[PDB]
């Protein structure tokens, strides 16, 4: 989850101001402009920090889910669990931030494509990696990218 709410018994020492932003709970983007377009959409699964595709079908309104390729619609940068909604930057808007990478093979200067699971994988091109893949926890890898569209 984006913010796993767990109670603790001791305070965690947090004084260093470096290597403190690369975390799974840091939503949004590293650099954001006031004129960035954001759309809230109903979601299924957990597409947080992943490429999202719009799935269209009691008939319900279209939703979004993790995906990519020819069906890529946008990037999920923030999530609200109570309302079960996801904030999405459309593919027509450039974005700079940390996204989920398939594995640790991604390095700097690498052109990256959103796979069927919304993860960034090496090689149409969609993003250019800025830093190396870093393991936040278990198999979760976060890579800083600057999305520019589709080739």
């Amino acid at each position: 989850m984006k913010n796993p709410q767990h109670d603790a018994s001791l305070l965690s020492n947090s004084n260093e101001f470096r290597d403190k932003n690369v975390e799974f709970f840091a939503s949004g983007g590293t650099r954001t402009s006031k004129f960035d377009k954001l759309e809230n959409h109903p979601f299924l699964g957990y597409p947080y920090k992943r490429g999202v595709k719009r799935v269209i079908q009691s008939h319900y309104e279209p939703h979004v889910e993790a995906g990519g390729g020819e069906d890529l619609y946008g990037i999920c940068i923030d999530i609200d669990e109570f309302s079960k909604t996801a904030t999405i930057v459309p593919i027509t808007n450039n974005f700079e931030g940390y996204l989920v990478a398939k594995d640790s093979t991604v390095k700097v200067k690498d052109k990256l494509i959103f796979n069927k699971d919304g993860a960034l994988e090496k090689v149409t091109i969609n993003a250019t990696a800025l830093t190396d893949a870093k393991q936040i926890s278990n198999e979760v890898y976060l890579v800083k990218v600057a999305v520019f569209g589709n080739k």
Binding site: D36, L38, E39, N40, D78, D80, T85
Partner: protein, 309 residues
């Protein structure tokens, strides 16, 4: 002015004796609204709003929100100015014709100005009521020799784009067939979101006589009232009889959001300033009135005609 205009003084004195028009019973108080005009046309604009998409959930940051649109529609209404002339006795000549408890020449049918104006106003009010009910101007029981009127000037009976039903001459005396046609028209009625409103029915004496017959220990009138209550959200249903109709049934709601009457504020009779005078004791006066101003939405009036041949 009253020191100089005896006729104006008499009109102001006797204006209260004129009876109220009976057309007021056919409308709710909110449905009638006066306008300032004598002759010409006036355009009415109605505004509406609609939802373009599902409402947008406000959570975290968002800039794309659902929108609400607007629309407009223009309806033109025509107003016509009509006039009448009547003869009466000159003011200075009343003393020579004041008889025992009555004034005027019985032999020559001459009247004082006040009485003449009152009677003429009553007649003109009756004519205005006939026009409002039927949409035509005629002084004959047959309803012919109708004065030609402008378009966009309709009554409750001839308003276009409404539910017209016709009962064939073979079933002119079959209340079951008439009620079948009435049910068909009522089903075809379209009240939309304003269905919770009182309803008004106008019938002719023959129709009322047929209605008060037993239902083939219930009456056709009761059955019709129940049928109308089934659609008007169990609200008031009023029934009226008018001798101006002939084998016609009119059904319409008394709601200002569907049918609106916007008469000119000079519609009722008004004296004219010009008075014809000569060397004799007989003078002439003119009365003005204005016709037009009925407005209705589409498919909200049921007009049933029982053909006689």
């Amino acid at each position: 002015l009253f020191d100089e205009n005896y006729y104006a003084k008499a009109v102001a004195n006797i204006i209260g004796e004129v009876k109220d028009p009976i057309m007021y019973k056919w409308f709710s108080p909110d449905q009638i609204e006066d306008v300032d005009l004598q002759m010409g046309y006036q355009k009415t604009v109605k505004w509406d709003a609609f939802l373009n998409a599902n409402p947008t959930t406000i959570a975290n940051e968002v800039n794309t929100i659902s929108t609400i649109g607007f629309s407009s529609e223009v309806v033109r209404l025509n107003y016509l100015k009509l006039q009448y002339k009547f003869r009466h006795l000159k003011q200075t000549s009343e003393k020579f014709y004041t008889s025992d408890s009555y004034i005027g020449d019985i032999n020559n049918n001459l009247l004082p100005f006040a009485q003449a104006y009152k009677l003429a106003s009553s007649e003109i009010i009756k004519l205005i009521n006939h026009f409002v009910l039927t949409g035509t101007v005629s002084i004959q029981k047959d309803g012919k020799n109708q004065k030609r009127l402008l378009p966009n000037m309709y009554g409750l009976l001839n308003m276009p784009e409404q539910i017209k039903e016709e009962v064939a001459s073979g079933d002119k005396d079959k209340m079951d067939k008439i009620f079948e046609k009435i049910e068909a028209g009522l089903s075809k009625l379209e009240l939309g979101d304003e269905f919770s409103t009182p309803m008004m029915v106008i019938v002719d004496p023959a129709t009322s006589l047929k209605l008060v017959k037993p239902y083939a220990c219930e009456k056709w009138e009761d059955v019709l009232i129940q049928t109308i209550k089934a659609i008007n959200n169990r609200e008031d249903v009023y029934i009226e009889t008018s001798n101006l109709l002939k084998h016609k049934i009119l059904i319409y709601p008394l709601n200002s959001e569907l049918i609106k009457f916007k008469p000119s504020k000079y519609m009722l009779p008004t004296p004219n300033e010009q008075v014809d005078k000569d060397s004799t004791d007989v003078a002439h006066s003119y009365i003005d009135f204005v016709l037009g101003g009925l407005l209705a939405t589409r498919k909200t009036i049921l007009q049933v005609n029982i053909k006689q041949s």
